[PDB]
Amino acid sequence: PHRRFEYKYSFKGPHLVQSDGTVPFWAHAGNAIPSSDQIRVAPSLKSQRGSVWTKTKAAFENWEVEVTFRVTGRGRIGADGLAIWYAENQGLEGPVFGSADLWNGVGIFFDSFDNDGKKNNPAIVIIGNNGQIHYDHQNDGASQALASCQRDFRNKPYPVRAKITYYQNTLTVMINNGFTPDKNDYEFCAKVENMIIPAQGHFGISAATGGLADDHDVLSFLTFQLT
């Protein structure tokens, strides 16, 4: 499949923020701090929430995002996590990893913290929604997850990269776990076949903290259109 880079749905360093403190083509909100080499979507303070969404909807039948990020904290346990979104409407504020609830599309959630106490976190969790489901914060999305994997994305020597691909109605998540500088060292995490999501949507990224707190940094969000 032939991939085209779509700058208008993308951001990255080294000149990420412009001088008025804004990210070109994207709206940020909540606690998000855009610097120039990254956006700290939610910093390591108690009870933060922040987000970054595209200004316009993208109308791609098939696509890929390459999202590079760090989730960093002093402890062996942190919270809450980081979400990557494709959704019919922007979800700038809310209780779901800092973004809005009852969304219509898909969220890929990097869930640092084990609310359901099943010792199966940090974890990466795919959650579809039609505008009627409340994310179940207290069960780490367990009964709502289409697919998932356990992957410790915290406190890594090199940045973590998620590659998220929607091709021919299947959604694949591949993760480079940040153990090495090789940026192509991806491993399979999860896949959802025969998945139907809106034909147009915003791309988004959000994060939040609770009583525990990591810094959630996103270095780049690169969006590609496929054929």
Partner: protein, 66 residues
Amino acid sequence: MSPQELQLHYFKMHDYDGNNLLDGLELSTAITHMSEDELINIIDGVLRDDDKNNDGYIDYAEFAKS
């Protein structure tokens, strides 16, 4: 130090990720050394005119051609 050597040095001065290609965001930093709609027109403009294989990038050959 020839004209072309400077075209080339210029090209790779804006290749911040070192993949030998210039994407829209890279070009945008050159185009601002204005509204987003002005910025979008220019970039869309560059890619329409100069990105032959339609992959979102312009390589040094495509760059020179302008």
